[PDB]
Amino acid sequence: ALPSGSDPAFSQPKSVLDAGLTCQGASPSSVSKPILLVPGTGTTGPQSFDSNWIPLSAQLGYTPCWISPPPFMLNDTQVNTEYMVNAITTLYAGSGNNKLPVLTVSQGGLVAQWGLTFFPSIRSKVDRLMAFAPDYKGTVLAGPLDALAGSAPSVWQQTTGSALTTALRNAGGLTQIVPTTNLYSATDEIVQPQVSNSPLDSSYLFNGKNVQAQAVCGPLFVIDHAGSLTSQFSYVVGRSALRSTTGQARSADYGITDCNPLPANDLTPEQKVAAAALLAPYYAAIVAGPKQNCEPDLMPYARPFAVGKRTCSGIVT
């Protein structure tokens, strides 16, 4: 079972949410073959995909579109999802009422499944989801000394055992809602645990196409968080998920010969070097970005699914 009924109301005006959506070389209301790219924590849309999937999806025939929820995905994850839901509705109608793919990284995958869980209207508008290193269960790795100064709202909510991650799980959000592919690695230095190749991993979704790099490439295969998005292996897996008639990556489309953790071969030399510096804005955000001293309160639609957890207002019930 999943949440049903009308979409919850947005807490932000539509002009604010519309302001966060951009398409490369096209208007959101008139776009050909759009793809929604959702960035990770501590970054904007261009910062996550300029070096990788904005050019890679454009070469595959898509119009790169993205959201950049302020500030740098560090604010309340529930509010970042409003940008995605509004963008999908806009891009669905903007492309002649046709389904569009969604490709994410880091918190972006958590944002995608959160929207599909609690905003039922977009379930018939997303044809597939290609999530790179998503943290559906949050992460057990604390911030690089983010325990005496607090952390960003989105960092609170991405901690294992948070009210947000609890509510997503309890609402049935750990089962895929659209055809979903999850590409992750046991060597992820930001999102853990990922070492079980099982529902214990943070990126695992039941009935999804869960691709742990070590399961395909070997137990000693190393590929970090940024590589999980930009690698040639990730391109092969992602390109398979986008081309597939089932909506999921196909095991026949990739193999041990594609196990390259370096940036995708099709990227230009400037793009590969830029892809290696993917987390540079993320590093700045965790050390010098906004911080608060409690996990943001749950919105009314998600509050009933995390009874017992403490947020800024107190205990849910």
Author numbering: 0 to 316
The authors write:
Here, we choose lipase B from Candida antarctica (CALB), as the model enzyme, in which Asp187-His224-Ser105 is the catalytically active triad. Lipases function according to the classical Ser-His-Asp catalytic triad mechanism. In the present study we propose that the Ser → Cys conversion in lipases may lead to high activity by accurate manipulation of the local environment surrounding the hybrid Cys-His-Asp triad, enabled by laboratory evolution. We succeed in evolving cysteine-CALB mutants that are even more active than WT CALB.
Notably, variant QW10, which has the natural catalytic triad Ser-His-Asp restored and only differs from the best variant QW4 by the residue at position 105, displays lower activity than QW4 with the hybrid Cys-His-Asp triad (entry 11). In order to gain insight into the basis of increased activities of QW4 and QW10, the crystal structures of both enzymes were solved and refined to 1.85 and 1.88 Å resolution, respectively. Most residues in the structures of QW4 and QW10 have very similar conformations. The raised mobility of loop 137–150 in QW4 and QW10 enables ready entry of bulky substrates, which can be attributed to the introduction of the V149G mutation. In QW10 and WT, three or four H-bonds exist between S150/W155 and Q291, while in QW4 there are only two H-bonds between G149/W155 and Q291. The kinetic data shows, inter alia, that variants QW4 and QW10 are much more active for several substituted benzoates than WT and QW1. For QW10 and QW4, S105 and C105 remain in close proximity to the substrate carbonyl group, favorable for nucleophilic attack to occur. Extra space is created by the induced open conformation of the QW4 and QW10 variants compared with WT and QW2, which may also account for the high activities of the best mutants. An extensive QM/MM investigation showed that for the QW10 variant, the first step of the formation process of acyl-enzyme complexes works via a concerted mechanism in which the proton transfer from S105 to H224 occurs simultaneously with the nucleophilic attack to the carbonyl carbon atom of the substrate. The calculated reaction barrier is 10.56 kcal/mol and the reaction is exothermic, the energy of the tetrahedral product being 25.75 kcal/mol lower than that of the reactants.
